Symmetry: C3
């Protein structure tokens, strides 16, 4: 559909937007003092739950942009990603180090997925 | 339409691109000597201008990635965003810090919207 | 089509994703010891190859985001872009400097295109 659907949840930093059978969402860490692996692993779990609640799923992710605050955390974030990603159904994947909006975020994950 | 429409199509870039009922655009500030907050507001206003010319609006933006040159300007670009954004019609957002091309850029905003 | 097609679908990533008449891809350099001009020119050549394998072309690219590891490489990557881009058929473009996963990468290029 060409009618935009927007979804706000109290426990969730980003809205979800659905349009033209496509879904956008940004995953942000919930446990600020946690390390990069935890934040990546738990943000990937957040994303699954958000996609499922709107019928989609981690199998239907088209493109993912992982922003990291520190180059030292690449290994940890690959380790989480690699434990979660669906073999043969993986999204196109962008990973860049950049400054994040909260100094305690080690990771932030933009998602575009099919609905 | 599955036909691609380009606005201000030059030799090396286009300013706006429209395809499959979706519009792409990067906004850059024109007020290059102003501060972050005021460069942001200016960018946002150009975006409104661009979206209105094609039939859309700031109520129909799907995703927005805000690049800041300096980590110290997060709070200020948020201030300019909250004055501009339409509550309950907000797009998904990304704000990160990276190097911009013109050294007088505090901010640069990439936009995907519906049309 | 509302079906998801993945090209070179691997364990942790897919090289290309195609959905809803839209194609997503991220080009990364092949020659790690090459300078930024070679890496950019070469990456634009890969993008073409990827687009035409799917029956699309570089005239059909909608949006491009170029990440450079070093601000000193801006001129080298514009020279490559300028030698390649299709006058009057260029996408929205956006260049920023950021940290990249491999320290030998001077450039990386994400592409959304019509297919």
């Amino acid at each position: 559909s060409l009618s935009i659907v927007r979804i706000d949840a109290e426990d969730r930093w980003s809205d979800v937007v659905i349009y033209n059978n496509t879904l956008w969402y940004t995953g942000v860490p919930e446990n600020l003092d946690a390390d990069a692996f935890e934040q990546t692993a738990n943000t990937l779990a957040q994303i699954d739950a958000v996609l499922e609640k709107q019928g989609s799923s981690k199998s239907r992710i088209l493109d993912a942009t992982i922003f990291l605050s520190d180059k030292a955390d690449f290994a940890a974030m690959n380790k989480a990603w690699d434990a979660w990603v669906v073999a043969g159904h993986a999204p196109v994947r962008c990973t860049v180090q950049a400054g994040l909006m909260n100094p305690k975020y080690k990771v932030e994950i933009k998602i575009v997925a099919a609905v």
